[PDB]
């Protein structure tokens, strides 16, 4: 909608919203990121800190497939498995704990963040956190490793 833009209201106005003293010249302060060390130093200091210079090692051929390790919390651990499993785990008097396969759901590491309901679990995951292991053993349950 060009009828809703600003160029409709500026017809008749001479400088077209760009000032009468200082004209709308083409590139008054350089192109793009020009002079970030010289005359745009203050803007990059106040708004983009750390932009200049190097830090850390140069990992040459990086692999995001190797870096792939999705995490899931214990607070929403029961969202991976259906709700009737939780119903039957609360209903069973014998103590048949449900097995939550985290790698089947699509996560590798289990972190322990929130409250876990008081019933035993068997969490089959690739990696575990110490706090997650403490929460699972405090509620009741086992942490089965899998490759």
């Amino acid at each position: 909608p060009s009828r809703l833009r600003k160029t409709r209201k500026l017809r008749g106005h001479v400088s077209h919203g760009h000032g009468r003293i200082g004209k709308h010249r083409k590139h008054p302060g350089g192109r793009g990121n020009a002079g970030g060390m010289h005359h745009h130093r203050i803007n990059f200091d106040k708004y983009h800190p750390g932009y200049f210079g190097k830090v850390g090692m140069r990992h040459y051929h990086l692999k995001r497939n190797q870096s792939f390790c999705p995490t899931v919390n214990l607070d929403k651990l029961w969202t991976l498995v259906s709700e009737q499993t939780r119903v039957n785990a609360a209903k069973n008097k014998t103590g048949a704990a449900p097995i939550i396969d985290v790698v089947r759901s699509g996560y590798y590491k289990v972190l322990g963040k929130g409250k876990l309901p008081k019933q035993p679990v068997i969490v089959k995951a690739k990696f575990f956190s110490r706090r997650a292991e403490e929460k699972i053993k405090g509620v009741g349950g086992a942490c089965v490793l899998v490759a």
Binding site: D45, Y47, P49, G50, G53, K54, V55
Partner: protein, 187 residues
């Protein structure tokens, strides 16, 4: 010669909503009558919050509704949320509640109707309580958006915990000069 500055003579607050939807305008047409004919301030607050934008009525989560109802004193009291009541999946127990909102998500409606509660609209809330007695007006997290993490004091400045506008986080993306005490300075 009159020396009053006309800078702040117009109050820029809303009179009508910017939305062109007709159900919200019908609720506005009903609460304009209730706000001027009832002495209660509840109808004025609900009418005011109907005018606001999407960012000004943030979504309210189901577990945070459960917490504010487990706050004592307000037993057998309905909950009035102007925004949306969304489901929070990281909760197990849920009592029956009397929820009044514009739109409630399908998982949250299934959870409330499985717990055995009641989900009302604003016209049904006006039929039940015209002045709004027996209500608890709630609201979602206003500063909870990611946009407010960039706001405030500027980064690269001492005692300023502000997320800088970075296109992609990493090792070599705004980490070296203004952030390390080794290379230059830090704040």
């Amino acid at each position: 010669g009159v020396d009053i500055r006309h800078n702040k003579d117009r109050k820029v607050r809303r009179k009508e909503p910017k939305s062109q939807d007709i159900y919200l305008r019908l609720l506005v047409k009903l609460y304009r009558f209730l706000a001027r004919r009832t002495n209660s301030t509840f109808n004025q607050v609900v009418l005011k919050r109907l005018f606001m934008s999407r960012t000004n009525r943030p979504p309210l989560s189901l577990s945070r509704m459960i917490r504010k109802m487990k706050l004592p004193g307000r037993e057998n009291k309905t909950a009035v949320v102007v925004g949306t009541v969304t489901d929070d999946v990281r909760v197990q127990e849920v009592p029956k509640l009397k929820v009044c909102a514009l739109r409630v998500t399908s998982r949250a409606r299934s959870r409330i109707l499985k717990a055995g509660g009641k989900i009302l609209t604003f016209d049904q809330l006006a039929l039940d309580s015209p002045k709004g007695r027996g209500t608890v007006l709630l609201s979602g997290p206003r500063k909870g958006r990611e946009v407010y993490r960039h706001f405030g004091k500027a980064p690269g400045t001492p005692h300023s915990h502000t997320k800088p506008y970075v296109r992609s986080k990493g090792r070599k993306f705004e980490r070296a000069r203004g952030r390390r005490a080794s290379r230059g300075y830090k704040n």
